[PDB]
Copies of this chain bind each other. A is one copy, B any other.
Amino acid sequence: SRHVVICGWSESTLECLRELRGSEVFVLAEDENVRKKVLRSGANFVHGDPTRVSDLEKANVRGARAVIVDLESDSETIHCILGIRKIDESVRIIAEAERYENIEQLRMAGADQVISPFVISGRLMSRSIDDGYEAMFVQDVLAEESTRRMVEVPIPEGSKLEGVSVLDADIHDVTGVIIIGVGRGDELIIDPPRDYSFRAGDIILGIGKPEEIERLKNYISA
């Protein structure tokens, strides 16, 4: 599909660029000595300031499918999000919040999704005092080297599972996948109750082996 713009260069954007091999990535960063490390990683570099609307227009924010924003501080992130929203009002913005109090301002400033790494890291370090399985789970289902994968499966138009409850479904027994949550629109219901009924076009979040994902996609086919 279309290209992806990454505003700023840090460690989070480096791992995002490592997992975005194959698609087209434009990196818009300020320093000129990052050109070798961006161009080595398989993405074109655009020298400029990410808060200026002209340099955002240079790096082709308009036709992109999502713009990933991570600058050095949090105020520059809010500035770049406002600049992107003056350019385009439909492009997807993914931001990085450095402090916990700024997530509401980063959502009201226009970002579609705010990822706070330090709050995740703090809660994982607070939860690894007694026994450390939560951090192992979160760091293994997001790694593209394990046997289990956390994927989204979509409900097609006119599937076999339209309107039937999840207690009458038993997706885990016949497909072998773990259903951790269902998604409709911009809301997510983790561990749905027995009375939840599926709709057409839903997004089901599941963890399972790849052949179990194939049995799931063959199970909810039309």
Contacts and interface: CB of A to CB of B under 8 A. Distances in A.
Given A86-B105, A115-B139, A125 B79 contact: no
B78 A82 contact: yes
Given A130-B152, A133-B183, A125 B12 contact: yes
A126 to B, nearest CB: 4
Given A79-B74, A86-B105, A190-B207, A120 B137 contact: no
Given A51-B75, A75-B79, A139-B119, A100 B15 contact: yes
Question: What band does the interface of chain A fall in when counting residues whose beta carbon is under 8 Å from B?
Answer: 35 or more
Given A82-B109, A105-B79, A191 B209 contact: yes
19 contacts: A11-B100, A13-B122, A14-B122, A15-B126, A20-B126, A52-B101, A54-B101, A74-B79, A82-B108, A109-B109, A113-B128, A115-B121, A115-B124, A117-B118, A119-B143, A133-B183, A146-B190, A148-B191, A178-B178
Given A11-B99, A13-B125, A116-B121, 20 more contacts: A11-B98, A11-B100, A15-B100, A16-B125, A18-B122, A19-B122, A20-B129, A51-B74, A65-B129, A66-B129, A75-B79, A78-B82, A82-B108, A83-B105, A92-B129, A120-B142, A123-B142, A137-B188, A141-B190, A178-B180
